[PDB]
Amino acid sequence: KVFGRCELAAAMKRHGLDNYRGYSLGNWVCAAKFESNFNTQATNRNTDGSTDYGILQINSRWWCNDGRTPGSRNLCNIPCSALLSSDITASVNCAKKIVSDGNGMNAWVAWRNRCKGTDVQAWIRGCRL
Ligand SMILES: C[N+](C)(C)CCO
Ligand SMILES: C[N+](C)(C)CCO
Ligand SMILES: [Cl-]
Ligand SMILES: [Cl-]
Ligand SMILES: [Cl-]
Ligand SMILES: [Cl-]
Ligand SMILES: [Cl-]
Ligand SMILES: [Cl-]
Ligand SMILES: [Cl-]
Ligand SMILES: [Cl-]
Ligand SMILES: [Cl-]
Ligand SMILES: [Cl-]
Ligand SMILES: [Cl-]
Ligand SMILES: [Cl-]
Numbered sequence: 001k002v003f004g005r006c007e008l009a010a011a012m013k014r015h016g017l018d019n020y021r022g023y024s025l026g027n028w029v030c031a032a033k034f035e036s037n038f039n040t041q042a043t044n045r046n047t048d049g050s051t052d053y054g055i056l057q058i059n060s061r062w063w064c065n066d067g068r069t070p071g072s073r074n075l076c077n078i079p080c081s082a083l084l085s086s087d088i089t090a091s092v093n094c095a096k097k098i099v100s101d102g103n104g105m106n107a108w109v110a111w112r113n114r115c116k117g118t119d120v121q122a123w124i125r126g127c128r129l
């Protein structure tokens with residue numbers, strides 16, 4: 001599924017991301033834009049053999065099991081395929097664990113490089129939430 005920005009903002013709010021760990025909805029929407037272009041089916045393989053999955057590009061190195069990332073963890077206790085669903089629940093629940101682990105949203109490199117410090121409210125401007 002490819003979301004529009006306001007559709008995704010509304011779904012993220014329903015699933016509890018609005019100001020989760022102090023990060024406003026615009027931060028989460030901005031991260032999703034630059035991680036996945038709002039596409040729940042996005043996958044990207046890293047040079048080291050891990051893979052990033054879904055709307056928030058969650059990495060098999062730590063967070064989900066894909067059976068092909070040697071030495072990795074599965075800290076969200078989920079198959080990585082579950083992070084590719086049209087329903088964003090599994091990705092949101094796993095993202096809550098990631099953002100709570102000490103470094104906030106800096107875990108998402110694209111957020112740090114493209115969203116952090118910017119006018120992220122523009123991502124939710126005009127949206128009926
Ligand atoms: C080690 N990380 C913090 C990157 C994830 C495991 O807690
Ligand atoms: C691209 N938008 C204008 C929708 C938000 C970016 O700031
Ligand atoms: Cl899709
Ligand atoms: Cl929209
Ligand atoms: Cl914020
Ligand atoms: Cl915002
Ligand atoms: Cl994801
Ligand atoms: Cl593995
Ligand atoms: Cl594990
Ligand atoms: Cl599994
Ligand atoms: Cl959803
Ligand atoms: Cl923080
Ligand atoms: Cl990470
Ligand atoms: Cl607004």
Ligand SMILES: [Cl-]
Pocket residue numbers: 006007126127128
């Ligand atoms: Cl809207």
Ligand code: NA
Pocket residue numbers: 005
């Ligand atoms: Na957009």
Ligand code: NA
Pocket residue numbers: 035052057109110
């Ligand atoms: Na990424």
Ligand code: NA
Pocket residue numbers: 060061062063064065066069072073074
């Ligand atoms: Na893993």
Ligand code: NA
Pocket residue numbers: 067068
């Ligand atoms: Na295996």
